[PDB]
Amino acid sequence: TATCAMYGNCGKKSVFGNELPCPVPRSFEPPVLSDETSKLLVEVCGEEWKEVRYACCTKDQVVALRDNLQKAQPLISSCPACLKNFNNLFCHFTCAADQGRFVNITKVEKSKEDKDIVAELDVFMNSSWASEFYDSCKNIKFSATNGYAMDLIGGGAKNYSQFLKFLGDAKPMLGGSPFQINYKYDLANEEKEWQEFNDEVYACDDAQYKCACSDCQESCPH
Ligand SMILES: *[C@@H]1O[C@H](CO)[C@@H](O[C@@H]2O[C@H](CO)[C@@H](O[C@@H]3O[C@H](CO[C@H]4O[C@H](CO)[C@@H](O)[C@H](O[C@H]5O[C@H](CO)[C@@H](O)[C@H](O)[C@@H]5O[C@H]5O[C@H](CO)[C@@H](O)[C@H](O)[C@@H]5O)[C@@H]4O)[C@@H](O)[C@H](O[C@H]4O[C@H](CO)[C@@H](O)[C@H](O)[C@@H]4O)[C@@H]3O)[C@H](O)[C@H]2NC(C)=O)[C@H](O)[C@H]1NC(C)=O
Ligand SMILES: *[C@@H]1O[C@H](CO)[C@@H](O[C@@H]2O[C@H](CO)[C@@H](O[C@@H]3O[C@H](CO[C@H]4O[C@H](CO)[C@@H](O)[C@H](O)[C@@H]4O)[C@@H](O)[C@H](O[C@H]4O[C@H](CO)[C@@H](O)[C@H](O)[C@@H]4O[C@H]4O[C@H](CO)[C@@H](O)[C@H](O)[C@@H]4O)[C@@H]3O)[C@H](O)[C@H]2NC(C)=O)[C@H](O)[C@H]1NC(C)=O
Ligand SMILES: *[C@@H]1O[C@H](CO)[C@@H](O[C@@H]2O[C@H](CO)[C@@H](O[C@@H]3O[C@H](CO[C@H]4O[C@H](CO)[C@@H](O)[C@H](O)[C@@H]4O)[C@@H](O)[C@H](O)[C@@H]3O)[C@H](O)[C@H]2NC(C)=O)[C@H](O)[C@H]1NC(C)=O
Ligand SMILES: CC(C)[C@@H](C)/C=C/[C@@H](C)[C@H]1CC[C@H]2C3=CC=C4C[C@@H](O)CC[C@]4(C)[C@H]3CC[C@]12C
Ligand SMILES: [Zn+2]
Ligand SMILES: [Zn+2]
Ligand SMILES: [Zn+2]
Ligand SMILES: [Zn+2]
Ligand SMILES: [Zn+2]
């Protein structure tokens, strides 16, 4: 029930670097998740991945996803709505069974193992989801001092497109993306073989994942 843009890794771009994913054709179907990879996926991405058997990610990909999400978690953990939206984006990007329909590989290069690895890709993104995602993180204050968390996870982004641009720009060694990820908002409606990323999104004043008024303006008494 899966279609992927990439699956597993095909070597390093340079020494001291990390593994980079292998592009796969659209007709590729991944195997069933191992017991170990499934339990790890539930710990990293939440209980919504329990009954998932086919995923577009291997165990090494889930581990790399875990190590990077844990570095960014303390910056936004005070606001559950932002943390939920933040984790949900990169979890679907890495492992969703429909990853091949909203992620488009645009550039590759050869690794040290002499195999094709991802150099640049596009993520077709629903504007409304990205806008609400930015709205749930923009007002988070970092408990140390009184600066905005958006200065670190978003580089001081003022709108959602600059936010996603900061997340997707290739920033290896700086805990960022190992390759260039471009978020596209102009996917034509005539394209039926592609779709935009879209999911449940949680506002910072949502009842289930409410954030403090110091981190959310709509959570303050009006
Ligand atoms: C998902 O991701 C994939 C992969 O990234 C995307 O696939 C690409 O889609 C585009 C269209 O959306 C395709 O462009 C069309 O390509 C054909 C074939 O192009 C070759 O031959 C023509 C001659 O027939 C050459 O002119 C081309 O060289 C350059 O053309 C233009 C002119 O400047 C330039 O912008 C291109 O970047 C291209 O540069 C490439 O040339 C070298 C030399 O070979 C190449 O090695 C290198 O890759 C350079 O990037 C090219 O050699 C072409 O005929 C079409 O031309 C007509 O279309 C446009 C409108 O679309 C008109 O403006 C134009 O005047 C022509 O009338 C297109 O250029 C592209 O090939 C394709 N990539 C593939 C198949 O690998 C998907 O689009 C993505 N899906 C999304 C976003 O939904
Ligand atoms: C979130 O906030 C960001 C930051 O403000 C914002 O990004 C900016 O968006 C605007 C609008 O899309 C961009 O403005 C365009 O800029 C290009 C060139 O930009 C370069 O140079 C600046 C210099 O500071 C750099 O910062 C930037 O990164 C780029 O390197 C211009 O060419 C554009 O002018 C055309 O605009 C229209 C589109 O074509 C035309 O109608 C218009 O007539 C202009 O045409 C001219 O250019 C054509 C192309 O060459 C040419 O054919 C024509 O003859 C004519 O000369 C436009 O001004 C701006 O660059 C973005 N900046 C950054 C840093 O991203 C986001 O839009 C915002 N997002 C949301 C959702 O709110
Ligand atoms: C990007 O994300 C957006 C937010 O999730 C997406 O917007 C959603 O788009 C769908 C499809 O266009 C809408 O569903 C339609 O809603 C209308 C209106 O429904 C209301 O009115 C009718 C009576 O007129 C009533 O019967 C309903 O119960 C509602 O009260 C319906 O008429 C349609 O049949 C269809 O259900 C969503 O409502 C809309 N949601 C939001 C929050 O805007 C957008 O589609 C996404 N774009 C892409 C390209 O993925
Ligand atoms: C807080 C700052 C540093 C911003 C940029 C956050 C970055 C993290 C959370 C995000 C940005 C891009 C994401 C990312 C890019 C691409 C891949 C390759 C894939 O095969 C495994 C997931 C992985 C490795 C993920 C992990 C999480 C990353 C690295
Ligand atoms: Zn590996
Ligand atoms: Zn989800
Ligand atoms: Zn859109
Ligand atoms: Zn580019
Ligand atoms: Zn098409």
Residue numbers in the entry: 20 to 241
Quote the study that presented this structure, word for word:
In eukaryotes, integration of sterols into the vacuolar/lysosomal membrane is critically dependent on the Niemann–Pick type C (NPC) system. The system consists of an integral membrane protein, called NCR1 in yeast, and NPC2, a luminal soluble protein that transfers sterols to the N-terminal domain (NTD) of NCR1 before membrane integration. NCR1 and hNPC1 share the same structural fold: an N-terminal domain (NTD), a middle-luminal domain, and a C-terminal domain found on the luminal side of the vacuolar/lysosomal membrane. The current transport model for the NPC system postulates that NPC2 binds sterols in the lumen and loads them into the NTD, which transfers the sterol to a tunnel that is formed by the middle-luminal domain and C-terminal domain of hNPC1 and NCR1, respectively.
